[PDB]
Design an enzyme around this catalytic site. Structure first.
Site, PDB file in Angstrom:
ATOM      1  CD1 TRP A 129      -2.195  -2.008   2.184  1.00 14.42           C
ATOM      2  CD2 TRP A 129      -2.782  -1.482   0.087  1.00 14.42           C
ATOM      3  NE1 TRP A 129      -3.112  -2.934   1.765  1.00 14.42           N
ATOM      4  CE2 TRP A 129      -3.492  -2.638   0.482  1.00 14.42           C
ATOM      5  CE3 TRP A 129      -2.989  -0.963  -1.201  1.00 14.42           C
ATOM      6  CZ2 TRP A 129      -4.392  -3.286  -0.361  1.00 14.42           C
ATOM      7  CZ3 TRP A 129      -3.883  -1.608  -2.040  1.00 14.42           C
ATOM      8  CH2 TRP A 129      -4.574  -2.762  -1.613  1.00 14.42           C
ATOM      9  CG  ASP A 171     -17.325  -0.029  -1.807  1.00  9.60           C
ATOM     10  OD1 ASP A 171     -16.697  -0.796  -1.049  1.00  9.60           O
ATOM     11  OD2 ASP A 171     -17.498  -0.271  -3.022  1.00  9.60           O
ATOM     12  CB  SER A 223      -7.176   5.128   7.799  1.00  8.81           C
ATOM     13  OG  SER A 223      -6.833   3.810   8.148  1.00  8.81           O
ATOM     14  CG  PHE A 224     -10.269   0.390   5.905  1.00  9.20           C
ATOM     15  CD1 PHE A 224      -9.139  -0.106   6.544  1.00  9.20           C
ATOM     16  CD2 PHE A 224     -10.457   0.087   4.551  1.00  9.20           C
ATOM     17  CE1 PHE A 224      -8.205  -0.901   5.842  1.00  9.20           C
ATOM     18  CE2 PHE A 224      -9.539  -0.701   3.849  1.00  9.20           C
ATOM     19  CZ  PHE A 224      -8.412  -1.196   4.498  1.00  9.20           C
ATOM     20  CB  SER A 238     -15.845  -4.781  -2.449  1.00 13.43           C
ATOM     21  OG  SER A 238     -15.518  -5.381  -3.691  1.00 13.43           O
ATOM     22  CB  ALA A 239     -11.760  -7.585  -3.056  1.00  7.20           C
ATOM     23  CG  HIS A 242      -9.018 -11.088   0.280  1.00 15.33           C
ATOM     24  ND1 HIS A 242      -8.241 -10.030  -0.145  1.00 15.33           N
ATOM     25  CD2 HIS A 242      -9.984 -11.242  -0.660  1.00 15.33           C
ATOM     26  CE1 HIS A 242      -8.715  -9.566  -1.288  1.00 15.33           C
ATOM     27  NE2 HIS A 242      -9.773 -10.284  -1.623  1.00 15.33           N
TER      28      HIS A 242
HETATM   29  N1  LIG Z   1      -6.091   1.881   5.703  1.00 15.94           N
HETATM   30  C1  LIG Z   1      -6.868   1.954   4.627  1.00 15.94           C
HETATM   31  N2  LIG Z   1      -7.986   2.693   4.658  1.00 15.94           N
HETATM   32  C2  LIG Z   1      -8.817   2.716   3.632  1.00 15.94           C
HETATM   33  N3  LIG Z   1      -8.584   2.015   2.538  1.00 15.94           N
HETATM   34  C3  LIG Z   1      -7.485   1.254   2.435  1.00 15.94           C
HETATM   35  C4  LIG Z   1      -6.584   1.210   3.488  1.00 15.94           C
HETATM   36  N4  LIG Z   1      -5.615   0.368   3.141  1.00 15.94           N
HETATM   37  C5  LIG Z   1      -5.895  -0.107   1.930  1.00 15.94           C
HETATM   38  N5  LIG Z   1      -7.038   0.425   1.497  1.00 15.94           N
HETATM   39  C6  LIG Z   1      -7.733   0.114   0.228  1.00 15.94           C
HETATM   40  O1  LIG Z   1      -8.333  -1.188   0.265  1.00 15.94           O
HETATM   41  C7  LIG Z   1      -8.622  -1.519  -1.105  1.00 15.94           C
HETATM   42  C8  LIG Z   1      -8.377  -3.021  -1.275  1.00 15.94           C
HETATM   43  S1  LIG Z   1      -8.360  -3.626  -3.003  1.00 15.94           S
HETATM   44  C9  LIG Z   1      -9.796  -2.799  -3.777  1.00 15.94           C
HETATM   45  C10 LIG Z   1     -11.107  -3.097  -3.052  1.00 15.94           C
HETATM   46  C11 LIG Z   1     -12.319  -2.558  -3.815  1.00 15.94           C
HETATM   47  N6  LIG Z   1     -13.484  -2.628  -2.922  1.00 15.94           N
HETATM   48  C12 LIG Z   1     -12.578  -3.409  -5.061  1.00 15.94           C
HETATM   49  O2  LIG Z   1     -13.433  -4.313  -4.959  1.00 15.94           O
HETATM   50  O3  LIG Z   1     -11.925  -3.141  -6.094  1.00 15.94           O
HETATM   51  C13 LIG Z   1      -7.680  -0.670  -1.965  1.00 15.94           C
HETATM   52  O4  LIG Z   1      -8.434   0.329  -2.659  1.00 15.94           O
HETATM   53  C14 LIG Z   1      -6.755  -0.017  -0.937  1.00 15.94           C
HETATM   54  O5  LIG Z   1      -6.402   1.296  -1.377  1.00 15.94           O
END
Ligand SMILES: Nc1ncnc2c1ncn2[C@@H]1O[C@H](CSCC[C@H](N)C(=O)O)[C@@H](O)[C@H]1O
Ligand SMILES: Nc1ncnc2c1ncn2[C@@H]1O[C@H](CSCC[C@H](N)C(=O)O)[C@@H](O)[C@H]1O
EC number: 2.1.1.303
Lengths: 325, 303
Positions: A129, A171, A223-224, A238-239, A242
């Site tokens: 990342w 999302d 940040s989530f 979404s994805a 994992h």
């Molecule tokens: N700490 C964080 N806070 C928010 N988003 C984050 C993060 N760390 C990673 N991500 C995001 O998590 C996502 C995972 S991959 C993309 C997921 C998207 N829902 C899809 O289905 O295409 C990426 O966009 C990455 O930028």
């Protein structure tokens, strides 16, 4: 798969040869007229003698042809290396692409097996990342790769769940907003927000401007792991899960349950252990993440004060519905 | 498939298992993830994920109890197995280590230089020359030529980069009155010591540890170097040849003796190496005077 041979199964020469050719865009050069090792080398910026050796190997693999004069050509199998090929495979192999760059991390797999930690950092000195955050080429590359993933397992996703009832959907880790875009287009009375890092969030806001959705869709750079936009009827993962270890996964789910409260729903969308071992290892090498079963998902849900209420299959992946426990 | 041909997950999974010697531990009695990880010093959860991938590949068996076992094929991972495959995969083994160098293949393709150094910071021959074990693993993991040339006339012959006993042992065995000396790095030279010793060649076979890039042991009626040519770039070679010359002085003849596309790429990755060639040697060094083709491998004599 035991009909190959130990050594052949452990071969690194062919996989890397393919990845180098993909990266050097060899197939596109010969299709453009650069047919001899020398012509392809000057075109791709390589060492003729060394490139020739790699081409001979790829001819043996059946991707290219080589006549008695040293003139190379593409077989129908080799056409797949062209960047314009409809299957879009060259992109996943190019060492400059997010995944092409990331898969080389498998070379450090022993570290992940001995520590449970990601191998990607052992090779590049930083997290995946962080790398994508610093390089728009890599970030944009990963986004394009994800869009391809969305197409394969998300077509018609708007009909596989009652999205309309949500009213507002967040999302979480929503990327460039491809999924939210598909949902809002089908459900015209639905509103939503993309929550992600600067990179994807900016691309998503750009997407919404472009397709005229900025009216019902917005973006939140955040940040989530921190508090999320509360009050929404649903939060989509979404994805995402994992990509993380259990500790971080529960942290994320916990922030979702927080924001959803007693009235909202949390939807985990991804391939339940039911891809397989291959992707699992990729998740481990890239982020120390992992593919989980519906059961492991339930165990994670409980720890965040959530409960699984249903699991909807939609293709290669499933939609797992969770609510306040 | 194309994305399949490029998979790195399975090859590395195999190599990590060989390195951790999972098959050996299993055969020893550790059949649980926690037990194997305990014996191999790994992370149990992560080790279990690797094994599950290998179960699906067909190397390991796993029962609903969590107990792991070896399949016919998995038996080959045994460090004890006859085929001795473990050596090709163990990251501690010569080729198991250098092979990871393939991850830097792009560097060799773009420049013609060895990939191995890009990964390990040191050269391949440096490491092997520093570890008699690592050295022996690469050799074991790897005749009439004498009855084709007049070695006897040389009297004494210095096998430059003679590795372990190798050719000299066969040369001295074919010519009971010839004497020889193996010049090589510590690693190979040690092995060359044990060999000549058991093969009872102590009297006419000797070993000197040194680089074939600096002043060489002169005198010898001929300086031989096989499988030493390609491992280097032109310069390197002529640089080496210069040494033979300064030690041969047209009073002695400097000899230069010399299947697998994947093996070919391995050579490029490891060394970045590979008659007008030996002539290019004749140019900036000892002049060519012949060539004698034996089977596949030839013998380019100079002076
Ligand atoms: N700490 C964080 N806070 C928010 N988003 C984050 C993060 N760390 C990673 N991500 C995001 O998590 C996502 C995972 S991959 C993309 C997921 C998207 N829902 C899809 O289905 O295409 C990426 O966009 C990455 O930028
Ligand atoms: N700088 C150096 N000085 C002396 N020997 C070297 C060297 N660099 C590499 N070598 C040796 O060159 C050999 C290449 S392998 C070929 C060995 C050869 N066929 C023989 O006669 O045994 C190895 O033994 C390696 O250890």
């Amino acid at each position: 798969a035991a009909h190959i041979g130990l050594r052949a199964l452990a071969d690194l020469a062919t996989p890397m040869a393919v990845r180098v050719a993909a990266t050097l865009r060899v197939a596109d050069h010969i299709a453009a007229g650069h047919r001899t090792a020398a012509e392809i080398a000057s075109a791709a910026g390589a060492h003729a003698d060394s490139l020739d050796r790699l081409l001979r190997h790829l001819v043996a693999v059946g991707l290219f042809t080589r006549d008695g004069q040293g003139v190379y050509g593409l077989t129908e199998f080799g056409e797949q290396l062209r960047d314009d090929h409809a299957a879009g495979k060259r992109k996943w192999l190019d060492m400059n692409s997010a995944v092409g760059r990331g898969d080389l991390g498998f070379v450090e797999l022993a570290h992940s097996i001995r520590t449970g930690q990601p191998a990607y950092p052992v090779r590049y000195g930083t997290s995946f990342w962080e790398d994508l955050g610093s390089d728009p080429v890599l970030s944009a590359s990963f986004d394009t790769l994800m869009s391809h993933h969305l197409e394969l397992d998300y077509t018609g996703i708007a009909a596989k769940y009652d999205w309309a009832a949500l009213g507002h959907v967040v999302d979480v880790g929503g990327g460039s907003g491809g999924l939210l875009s598909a949902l809002l287009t089908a459900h015209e009375d639905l509103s939503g927000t993309v929550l992600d890092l600067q990179g994807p969030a900016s691309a998503a806001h750009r997407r919404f401007l472009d397709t005229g959705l900025s009216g019902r869709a917005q973006v939140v750079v955040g940040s989530f792991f921190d508090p999320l936009p509360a009050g929404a009827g649903g939060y989509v993962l979404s994805a995402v899960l994992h990509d993380w270890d259990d500790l971080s996964a529960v942290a994320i789910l916990r922030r979702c349950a927080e924001a959803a409260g007693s009235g909202g729903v949390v939807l985990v969308i991804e391939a339940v252990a039911g891809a397989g071992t291959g992707m699992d290892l990729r998740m481990l090498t890239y982020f120390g993440g992992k593919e989980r079963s519906l059961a492991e998902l339930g165990e994670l849900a409980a720890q965040a004060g959530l409960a699984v209420r249903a699991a909807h299959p939609i293709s290669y992946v499933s939609i797992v519905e969770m609510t306040a426990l």
